[PDB]
Amino acid sequence: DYKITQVLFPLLYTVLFFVGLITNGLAMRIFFQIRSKSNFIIFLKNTVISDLLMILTFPFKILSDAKLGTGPLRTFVCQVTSVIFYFTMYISISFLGLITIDRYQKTTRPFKTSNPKNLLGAKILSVVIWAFMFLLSLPNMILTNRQPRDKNVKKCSFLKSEFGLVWHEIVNYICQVIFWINFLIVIVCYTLITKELYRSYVRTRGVGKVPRKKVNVKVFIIIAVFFICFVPFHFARIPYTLSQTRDVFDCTAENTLFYVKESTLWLTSLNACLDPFIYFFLCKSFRNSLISML
Amino acid sequence: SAEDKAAAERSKMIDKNLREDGEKAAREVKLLLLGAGESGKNTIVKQMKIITGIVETHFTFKDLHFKMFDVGAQRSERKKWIHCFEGVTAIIFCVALSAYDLVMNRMHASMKLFDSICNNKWFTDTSIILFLNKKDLFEEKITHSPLTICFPEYTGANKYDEAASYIQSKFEDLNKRKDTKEIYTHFTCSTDTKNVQFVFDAVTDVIIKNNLKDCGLF
Amino acid sequence: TASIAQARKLVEQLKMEANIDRIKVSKAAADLMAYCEAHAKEDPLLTPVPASENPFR
Amino acid sequence: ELDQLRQEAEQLKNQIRDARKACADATLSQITNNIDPVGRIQMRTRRTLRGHLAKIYAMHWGTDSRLLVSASQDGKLIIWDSYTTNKVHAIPLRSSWVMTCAYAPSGNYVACGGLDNICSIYNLKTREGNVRVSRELAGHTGYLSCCRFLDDNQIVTSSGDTTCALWDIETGQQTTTFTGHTGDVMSLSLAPDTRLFVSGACDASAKLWDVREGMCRQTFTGHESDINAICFFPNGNAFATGSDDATCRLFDLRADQELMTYSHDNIICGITSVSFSKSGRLLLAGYDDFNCNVWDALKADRAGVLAGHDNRVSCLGVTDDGMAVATGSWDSFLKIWN
Ligand SMILES: CSc1nc(N)c2ncn([C@@H]3O[C@H](COP(=O)(O)OP(=O)(O)O)[C@@H](O)[C@H]3O)c2n1
């Protein structure tokens, strides 16, 4: 029994949910209306699909958190809904990294064009990463065969076998490594993109400064969103994994551990409705399409 | 169905060839030249381009293929064919620095031409590579003739550095967008591999913006 | 001479273009309607033909 | 001298205007109330010909109502098979700037031209091997607006030099020069008898021209803006002119009158292509509002909408028998409607 304020917490999600339910919807018809011109379009479509899946998983999570029995709904949420939410969020991370890589390639190598073979390869890579995330998430959904031993508690860390627990720890370590690699790649590529734009501007325009800061203020928005909403989750993920798998942390530490982990999880889930907003704020064509829709 | 199969095979081969040609065309850079006949437009062509209404000039610089287009021979209405230049990488506008007092002034005629080109519905997102050529002649002509006769708005003193820098700013204020179109201004010189060097950088700058506009960064 | 030759040509053309015989607009409208009704049956655009003999199905 | 000539021209112009007003006793719309309107017409995209990679500007149908030809800014002129949706031919163009596209009545030659002032006519037979250059007419100083084949040995080209040219394929040189316009020409169409063709320029007038003599028959100063779309009625005694002020005006030859106009509040954009039907009851026009309209030539009301494109329309075509309609709108795509 952490606190009664637990009931207050999924309310944020539904405040996060309803608006999200329309934002991805706004991105559902606009992003898919245009054809697959380049790899960025495919990656953005996959990202909005992942965000829609996040929105689909949210009401189950809020129902489990607010008030629900351990048996009928908590086991179902912890078995598939939670795991699908996690690997879809990892897929969104990977596709954000792919978008950053595509932008870096388009900036550093501007003369290279996107061929049909390049689009086919990008689609193949998307399918491969989707299948990879599904394959790693499958044991996390099939190894939770243990029945709930206790009905009063809602923590589903005991609903998993010893091999299930060791595979869960391996999955956490692998996904932490993947996230760190993707984060460093994104940071490096965005810094290189800003440097390349600055160099191009000083080669062409010279000592101008007014439009040079326009790209700096928009790149930082992506960096800020990817930092303040993904990174604290992975700072707090390792202690939570150690507490769930091992017993190295004591009882009173579990309260603040759960609090910070769940708050960081909410911050991560905010990205589902944040990504449509930032992607519409960045590209002017998306704003034009949204205005024409109204 | 042998005839149908042969027709399908021919269509597939034609489609492959057309895709290859389209890739080759998209890899190359298209630039449209605009301005006046006596503004030094032909001076830029006869610099390093070793390789009848349109004068097509093709040259390779740093493993990049360019395609210049000249519309000087088209002595007709511009708006009936200016829409055919959609998707060009940039517009190379050439205006003479020394043509401020030739007579209905030459500078006013170029500004009126530049105003229509820069503020038309066809080149809203197309950058302009402005060229203030013939800067060498501008040095010995600024002292004899000031800019007061062209317009009384020049409160500043008449100097080669001051006038050339200020007359450069006389073209950006004509741009109403100032967000989708960026005007790149350069003064032509006789230095080897220096005038075309700016064009390569200007093309790279607009392409980078174009390569990121569809990528969501703009 | 050169500044007036084109004017003379234009006025002569406009003068001799008015010597043609013109029929009433009602007769022309009647002929147009008659031609429209004569080929109305053999017009796929006016009458949507069945897909059986339609080469674009 | 000049003042006297100007005064005489103005006097004769007002005299001819008074004669035209006296000739118009009853308008077409006043007597059209007897015929039953066709009503709403539904036309769907049967074939989507997606082979081009640039903005298509012109096309033309063959006399066989099956084989067409299209021109875009990719430097490729594509002869399409509309039946099986395949590329019969694809010929490179030395100039990517092409705005005209004509197809020979016998189907052996195809012409293309544009900003290069040169009309290139290529032989579609080429039994000796690959396609090759056949003729290159270079006598125009304008952007070579449009071209139309009279036969295998005569082609009429209207250009941006305010003049029209009738050429000969065998000789390769201009034969007849049409000099009546005051503004540059944008489009022209040939009559079924191939003896009297109308031409539209940007001086808000449509002028008739005879193939043999070359003198101007009639002039219609009906519109108030530049005319860029024009086509003959199937009988050959009427035609339609489309301007950029959302105005399509029908002009009769023998009547020599402004007959009826497509003035509507919804349309405010320009017009690019105008065609007719087999019987001429349907007038298919293309507007800058990203879709094509199909008006009733008699009832003066709209009957169909071809909203399938996502860009400005540039080329419209209707077969001789009216079997199908081809639409191409700046999107490298052709759409077939029935
Ligand atoms: C590739 S999908 C994935 N990735 C992780 N890093 C994960 N970390 C934990 N999970 C599983 O996510 C669900 C709930 O997360 P946990 O933190 O392990 O348990 P709770 O604190 O009750 O939410 C369980 O089914 C876990 O097996 C994960 N699933």
Numbering used by the authors:
A (entry chain A): 20 to 313
B (entry chain B): 6 to 56, 183 to 234, 241 to 355
C (entry chain G): 6 to 62
D (entry chain C): 3 to 340
Provide excerpts from the study:
Thus far, eight human P2YRs have been characterized and are classified into two sub-families based on their sequence homology and signal transduction mechanisms, including P2Y1R-like receptors that signal preferentially through Gq/11 proteins and P2Y12R-like receptors that activate Gi/o proteins. P2Y1R and P2Y12R, which recognize the same endogenous ligands ADP and ATP, play vital roles in platelet aggregation, making them attractive drug targets for the treatment of thrombotic diseases. P2Y1R activation initiates shape change and activation of the platelets, while P2Y12R activation further amplifies this process and results in platelet aggregation. Thus, we solved the fully active structures of P2Y1R and P2Y12R bound to the agonist 2MeSADP and different classes of heterotrimeric G proteins, G11 and Gi2, respectively (the antibody scFv16 was used to stabilize the G11 protein).
In P2Y1R and P2Y12R, the agonist 2MeSADP exhibits different binding poses and the binding sites only partially overlap in the diphosphate region. In contrast, the adenine group penetrates deep into a narrow binding cavity within the receptor transmembrane core when bound to P2Y12R, forming extensive interactions with helices III-VI. Alternatively, the 5ʹ-diphosphate group is engaged in two salt bridges with R933.21 and K2807.35 and three hydrogen bonds with Y1053.33, Y2596.58, and Q2636.62 in helices III, VI, and VII of P2Y12R. In contrast to P2Y1R, where the receptor activation is regulated mainly through repositioning of residue side chains within the ligand-binding pocket, P2Y12R modulates its activity in a more global way. Compared to the antagonist AZD1283-bound inactive structure, the extracellular ends of helices VI and VII display large inward displacements upon binding to 2MeSADP. This conformational change in the extracellular binding pocket is most likely associated with the outward movements of helices VI and VII in the intracellular region, and thereby creates a cavity for G-protein accommodation. Furthermore, due to interactions between 2MeSADP and helix V, the extracellular part of helix V in P2Y12R slightly shifts towards helix VI by 2.6 Å. Lacking the conserved residue P5.50 (N5.50 in P2Y12R), this helix exhibits a straight conformation with rigidity that facilitates relaying the conformational change in the extracellular region to the intracellular side. Thus, the conformational change of helix V in the ligand-binding pocket is likely linked with a movement of its intracellular region towards helix III, which enables its interaction with the Gi protein. For P2Y12R, the residues L3017.56 and C3028.47 in the linker region move towards the C terminus of the Gα α5 helix, packing tightly against the main chain of G353G.H5.24 in Gαi2.
